[PDB]
Ligand binder design. Structure first.
Ligand code: HEC
Ligand code: HEC
Ligand code: HEC
Ligand code: HEC
Ligand SMILES: [Ca+2]
Ligand SMILES: [Ca+2]
Ligand code: NA
Ligand code: NA
Ligand code: NA
Ligand code: NA
Lengths: 376, 125, 355, 376, 125, 354
């Protein structure tokens, strides 16, 4: 209840009283831990953007990373590094385009790699976490390409070198399940498993179709790589879950995030990152509110929490803010993070009682994307 | 003004987020940075790629197909920002998907997003 | 008179007496049963038609007359784009100006001159009756008058509903009488979102009253020579079909290799495709477009031959702005485009569609 | 009454009703005229920034130009081109620095020149219009350097090449008076006249010291190249007028913008571009409010207008908003432009009676600098 | 919070713009982007140039010289922006001037402005 | 008691008996009338001192003893920066360990051994009394105890208020007793804003109680050899003065060429400057730092010679991060710096200033 700034004013004043000298210098961020959280600000399509590194336990900005045009952040689950795929131009937003990947040390935040991507191959789109992804060993970054056609670009972070583009079918998003394998979601309603070497036609296998042409699967599914759990809401709060843990798709029973009464009274999911998944609790969190069927990208004020196994509602939190994106820490007694684009604030909640504990404001221009590491 | 209410088109002001042809716009209206409803601002590059929505025109009761177009090669205008999603489908239905930066085809390989125009291309409900 | 004129033109259209050896009428190359195209096989397959002498082949594919009457007369618009006209190179101003040309063209109907055409018209008492009723007495005695009158009647005939009925599934769907299948609907959605619409739609924006799927402009899409057609025409291995630049009066070398954008109505049934009939299948004509967008090696290969498409006949003034869209058509989208283009088929030709 | 966006929906409805086709295309900005106004947004030191081109008659944005870090804009007085000196970095705000000048066509807004400035020689500072200046012939751009010392870069717009740096003494700002001559203001409180040929040292001559060591001259003097009038306010609203029209500095009678009683009740100038000068009217506009002596950069709610020769006050406007910058158009019946950094909105007033006519909002993050061309 | 009122320094919160040491800060407070009062955030470069101000400390009534220093090589942080100008002089008295991007001496030639730290280096006198 | 010890060192300090030929005392080279430096002209002018033999010149400029008592004992700090000790290369831990070394140095006072020092000490009845009162009976009969006691006396004398009086104008101004002139305050402003404060201030932040205008650190600022001082020293044209590295037990090649940041107190009256006295004028010392920042031809040239400064004696470990500040000192600021530095002169040496 003593704030950050207040405690800090008390300590500087004590040092001044004591004749305490110290050397002005560049701080190191605290060690990455389960309660660090990163918030990416695509800034409503601005040519340059920011990420904030936050200690969610303190509610304190501990660092920042600059990026260019709609970069894709990724965070190694073990905390050893962070990276992004970014795009810059020789004259702000015009002239020659350079796409690249940087890797950063998670405490000094310095770039430890800057890997040029040839032929400007990134997909420029409102930020979707699973359009750029790390493999589980942290060795490879996979990024999606839409033009001329769907493709996936393979970047070696270990050897700090772009490898190749892989041709894919009419499919979207990249869920890595192994050093050489990832899943995508296809137009025809199946998933495609993509297995890749250094060379050859990658082996591409479709799963069974798992949804009709008129159920709409949202751009922001939750994927837990350590659980292999892909949690995929539709526009109605119907939740698809696919178990990728065997390395093949197993389709789990669908659950309904909302009741039939709530659906009849206009409750639907909506926002940007609408869904979160806590691996250790096996719980799903969904951003929902009463809304017309085509206001699916608007903020929502409520989170439903349900047991992933049974679909049983565990809670419904009234968030008390216009929340676009949520995510949770992966530790015991997780934090529930609730990011307001309109407010440029990350609100930090006890994921158990839903109570707001603290918040971090002034996060850029239109912050949209929350990332945590799953370290346990 | 209630972000969650059903969208209500009007045909009396193109700078407004509820202007009928912006029913699936994402970004900024070009009219507000020196384009017009259907032309790009000076110094930007007109994409040839398009996204479509079926938008109800409350002037004549008809729904029209709006093939949106981006004006590219400039940082985002920051004026008349709007996001509507009437009929908007997820990315894997890209013809109706509006988070994508549709700058393909723009002169000089321009790919940064500046603003979007809303020309009609035909009728159909 | 509006009826009677079309009615006279209907008679002329099917009359092989307007050809030198009387073997050939407009209907011979423009056959009503095949959407007013030539079903006949020549030394180049269906790519080019054989004239009245039974041996001369032309150098361009015979186009449909369907919806040809919606084409504006030839003009340069304000943006300096040429538009409208008849023939693939726009060298005729309009239907009337075009109609007398097959008649005197030694590679087509081959009449020696207007006087000889008048003489044939005079030999038929029905023409003396029908021409004199519309054009006055002794019209057939004046070679200039008679030849102009036949062209006019033919043009009026091509402007009737019989030629542009607007009863395709597309039209029926646009009138709310039925719905597209999901594949057709996707096809229509691709057509309008991808670059096709930049050239194959009447208007840049707004709604066309009578859409014929062309903006009537001239574009070089970089098609190679049709070697077998070009051999048949005997124009020479060093000949260049300069498209619009051949129109007398056009001198601008920027117009070299541009041809008029064809209406896609009835396209499913008027193969082979393009101005030299170079492509046999509709899918192939769609796939040519991927040579400009796709980075896959298969995109630079004509699936009908397994060889590269070829060097363009005119490797300059290509419409690269439109063609290099940055987005290729995957197979599912080419499938949708084929299904949609098939909806552009007139009701009477639907049965042609099966094969 | 009918707004621009209303008139435009009506014209579009009518076009639709009539079946009028029109080709989607890149618009040309209307011809530059007296009522064109440029608003530069340094964006509170963001690495990328924006300049808005506005038709101040319509209160319409007619175009925009992008710029890098703290760019310096200039606008040819005859309306034939615009330019800026700007700075980019290879990875947003990090990596290799490139300083450069762009010249732009002012109806297509297309870059007509991009002239690299060797060894990153630009002064990076909160934007001061006369830290970068066109010579009157428009053939030469001069920009200030601070590090390693005061110096001035000569840029040839016609040859489209950087020429050389000139050494100057301890002076600031650049007020060009001729093809080969500019004045600067020195630490000792003199002006220095700098004359350069192709070769050698420039010929540098100092005037008398014209202010005491403790009267502080603001960073944003108004300079009118066509009248050769340098209007230089101090922190108290005292105003120095230097006449440079002979090739040489005649010092005009100094004049006071606020009254004795007003500086007793704490009336002071404050803002960014606190002062504007209308050339044919020979008239000075000053942003002022009641403020502490060290709140000299804060917005003001009031504009006073005085005669350059007599210094009699002609008007005092209650602006109705927090104004940080002012400027005027240079035609008859001038517009008075009032830029609020805080509202990001340019308010456009009748310079005569002071009432707000119209305004142009959403002008970036922290717009600060108004530029107009003196065309008549 | 009245912007034209005389500045009222406090010694109880370093993130607020009325903090006593910030009396001539121009930009952003580094404590809000992962620095601290006298340290730079990770990834930035500390300049060796500085600005000085004499700043009044309400806690002991004493005046300290603050030699501000910029943390450079990052885009402006956008958090806790503050502009105070106590004793701040025009650019030709650059030792007291605060629009200048005082990033000289920063490692790697870093010259972009991210934020400013507020260390004491003496008593005014 | 602490008082008598210092009175004992006051005696020894001006006693030539502690030199071999009895021609010199500490005060001969550390002249009290010259802020404890050497007024005497030599083969290299004032750059280096002549010892007791009347011939041998040193290779380093004799520094002031004023304020040396504020220097902490030599240590490596937690950042791995060496700080403090005595001599330009910190090879003495502190004043006590320094005091015996001139006595036994053949190019200085030239006593053969501790024994001969002790013998000289016993020859004086005043020392038998003074020393025996402080360290006990027989102290002078034991040459190890005698020498070490003389060292202690000297060190205690140097730690008196007389050596560090903090009565310069700058001390007065900090006490609010007087104001700087505009030039002096500008100079102070220039000194704290520009790179000088990075090395020539005790602390990095907060307020120093007894500022002596050094952080006690070791820096190679890339000075050239003093050609005539080097020839006079007889150490050979081959010789390299490795600064800190020459301290025994310093092994790290990174300290080569590094010297103890001198206190700037009395700078104005203690020319010539730098460890080797290469520059006669204080302005030249200030101007030398412009070699790393200005681009002007004039910066590359030593004004006292008209020829380039010359290459660094040790052209590695330069403190570039600090020295390459991006900003040069125009003539005006060099003027002000000079004026501010002149305010660092002790009261008693103010008349020297003219
Ligand atoms: C031997 C076959 C043949 C005969 C008979 C023939 N045509 Fe054609 N038709 C063509 C070919 C080939 C073209 C394309 C020629 C070109 O563009 O140079 C053409 C094109 C035309 C066009 C232009 C259509 C377009 O889209 O540009 C019209 C109109 C036309 N024919 C009408 C007629 C009429 C009326 C007659 C009878 C007087 C006739 N044709 C006789 C082969 C023939
Ligand atoms: C830049 C202009 C342009 C674009 C884009 C374009 N076309 Fe064409 N199209 C042409 C022109 C011109 C021709 C005639 C070319 C020739 O014969 O010289 C043509 C011919 C065709 C034909 C042959 C019709 C016939 O009667 O022989 C088909 C089928 C066709 N286009 C479909 C498409 C589809 C589907 C697309 C989008 C993938 C498309 N076009 C894009 C201009 C264009
Ligand atoms: C012959 C001239 C000469 C005499 C006599 C001499 N000194 Fe020195 N003093 C020097 C020189 C030269 C240096 C620097 C030598 C070096 O750095 O290696 C020096 C350095 C010092 C220092 C270190 C000061 C600093 O800031 O590093 C102290 C303390 C000192 N002398 C005290 C004494 C005492 C006590 C005596 C009498 C025992 C004495 N000196 C006799 C010339 C002399
Ligand atoms: C990188 C640390 C550093 C910086 C920055 C620095 N100095 Fe020094 N200064 C030294 C060292 C070390 C010496 C002694 C060097 C030597 O003799 O080898 C020295 C010596 C001096 C001397 C000679 C003192 C004497 O007794 O011989 C003067 C005068 C001086 N500096 C003034 C300045 C001024 C003024 C500035 C700012 C323009 C400055 N210095 C910047 C470290 C520094
Ligand atoms: Ca055909
Ligand atoms: Ca000396
Ligand atoms: Na062929
Ligand atoms: Na021609
Ligand atoms: Na010498
Ligand atoms: Na050693």
């Amino acid at each position: 209840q003593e704030t950050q700034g207040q405690a800090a004013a008390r300590a500087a004043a004590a040092d001044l009283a004591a004749g305490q000298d110290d050397e002005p210098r560049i701080l190191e961020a605290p060690a990455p831990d389960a309660r660090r959280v990163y918030v990416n600000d695509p800034a409503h399509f601005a040519a340059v953007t920011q990420q904030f590194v936050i200690d969610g336990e303190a509610g304190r900005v501990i660092g920042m990373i600059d990026g260019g045009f709609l970069p894709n952040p990724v965070v190694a689950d073990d905390g050893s590094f962070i990276a992004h795929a970014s795009t810059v131009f020789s004259r702000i937003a015009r002239g020659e385009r350079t796409d690249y990947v940087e890797v950063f040390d998670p405490v000094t935040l310095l770039p430890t790699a800057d890997i040029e991507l040839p032929d400007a191959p990134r997909f420029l789109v409102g930020t979707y976490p699973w359009m750029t992804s790390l493999t589980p060993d942290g060795k490879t970054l996979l990024f999606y390409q839409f033009s001329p056609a769907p493709a996936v670009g393979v970047v070696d972070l270990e050897g700090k070198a772009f490898k190749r583009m892989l041709d894919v079918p009419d499919c979207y998003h990249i869920f890595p399940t192994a050093p050489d394998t990832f899943f995508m979601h296809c137009r025809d309603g199946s998933l495609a498993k993509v297995a890749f070497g250094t060379e050859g036609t990658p082996e591409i296998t479709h799963t069974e179709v798992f949804h009709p042409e008129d159920e709409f699967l949202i751009n922001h599914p939750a994927y837990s790589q350590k659980a292999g759990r892909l949690v995929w809401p539709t526009y109605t709060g119907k939740i698809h879950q696919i178990d990728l843990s065997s390395g093949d798709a197993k389709f789990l029973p669908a659950v309904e995030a909302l009741t039939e009464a709530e659906r009849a009274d206009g409750w639907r999911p909506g926002g940007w990152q609408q869904v979160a998944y806590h691996r250790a609790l096996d719980r799903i969190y969904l951003l929902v509110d009463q809304r017309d069927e085509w206001r699916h990208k608007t903020a929502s004020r409520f989170v439903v929490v349900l047991d992933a196994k049974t679909g049983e509602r565990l809670a419904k939190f009234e968030m008390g803010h216009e929340i676009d994106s949520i995510n949770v820490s992966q530790d015991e007694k997780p934090l529930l993070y609730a990011l307001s684009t309109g407010d440029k604030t990350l609100y930090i909640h006890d994921a158990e009682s839903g109570e707001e504990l603290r918040s971090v404001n002034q996060l850029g221009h239109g912050p949209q994307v929350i990332t945590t590491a799953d370290m346990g | 003004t209630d972000p969650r209410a059903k969208w209500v088109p009007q045909d009396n002001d193109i700078q407004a987020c509820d202007y009928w042809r912006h029913c699936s716009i994402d970004g900024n209206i070009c009219d507000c940075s020196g384009g017009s409803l259907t032309n790009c601002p000076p110094g930007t590059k007109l994409a040839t790629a398009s996204w479509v929505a079926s938008c109800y025109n409350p002037t004549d009761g008809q729904s029209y197909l709006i093939a949106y177009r981006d004006c590219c090669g400039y940082n985002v205008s920051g004026r008349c920002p709007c996001l509507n999603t009437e009929g908007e489908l997820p990315v894997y239905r890209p013809e109706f998907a509006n988070d994508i930066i549709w700058c393909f085809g723009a002169e000089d390989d321009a790919m940064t997003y500046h603003c979007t125009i809303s020309p009609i291309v035909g009728k159909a409900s | 008179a509006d009826d009677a004129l079309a009615a006279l033109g209907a008679q002329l259209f099917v009359d092989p007496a307007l050809s030198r050896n009387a073997t050939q009428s407009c209907a011979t190359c423009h056959d009503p049963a095949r959407a007013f195209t030539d079903p006949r096989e020549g030394k180049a397959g269906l790519a080019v038609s054989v004239g009245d002498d039974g041996q001369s082949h032309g150098d361009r594919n015979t186009p449909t007359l369907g919806y040809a009457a919606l084409v504006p007369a030839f003009h340069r618009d304000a943006n300096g784009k040429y538009k409208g006209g008849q023939f693939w190179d726009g060298r005729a101003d309009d239907l009337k100006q075009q109609a007398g040309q097959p008649m005197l063209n030694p590679v087509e109907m081959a009449m020696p001159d207007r006087a000889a055409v008048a003489a044939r018209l005079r030999d038929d008492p029905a023409y003396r009756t029908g021409f004199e009723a519309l054009f006055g007495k002794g019209v057939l005695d004046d070679p200039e008058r008679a030849f102009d009158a036949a062209a006019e009647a033919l043009a009026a005939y091509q402007a009737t509903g019989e030629f542009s009925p607007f009863d395709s599934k597309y039209d029926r769907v646009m009138r709310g009488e039925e719905k597209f299948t999901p594949l057709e609907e996707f096809g229509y959605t691709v057509f309008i979102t991808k670059n096709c619409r930049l050239c194959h739609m009447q208007r840049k924006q707004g709604v066309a009253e009578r859409e014929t799927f062309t903006n009537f402009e001239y574009h070089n899409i970089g098609l190679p020579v049709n070697e077998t057609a070009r051999e048949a025409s005997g124009l020479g291995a060093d000949h260049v079909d300069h498209g619009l630049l051949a129109r007398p009066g056009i001198e601008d070398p920027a117009q070299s290799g541009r041809f008029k954008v064809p209406s896609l109505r009835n396209v499913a049934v008027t193969g082979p495709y393009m101005h030299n009939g170079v492509f046999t299948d509709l899918r192939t004509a769609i796939l040519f477009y991927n040579k400009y967008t796709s980075r896959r090696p298969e995109a630079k290969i004509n699936p009908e031959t397994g060889a590269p498409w070829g060097e363009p006949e005119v490797a300059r003034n290509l419409s690269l702005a439109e063609l290099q869209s940055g987005l290729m058509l995957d197979d599912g989208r080419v499938d949708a485009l084929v299904a949609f283009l098939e909806t552009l088929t007139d009701r009477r030709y639907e049965p042609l569609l099966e094969e």
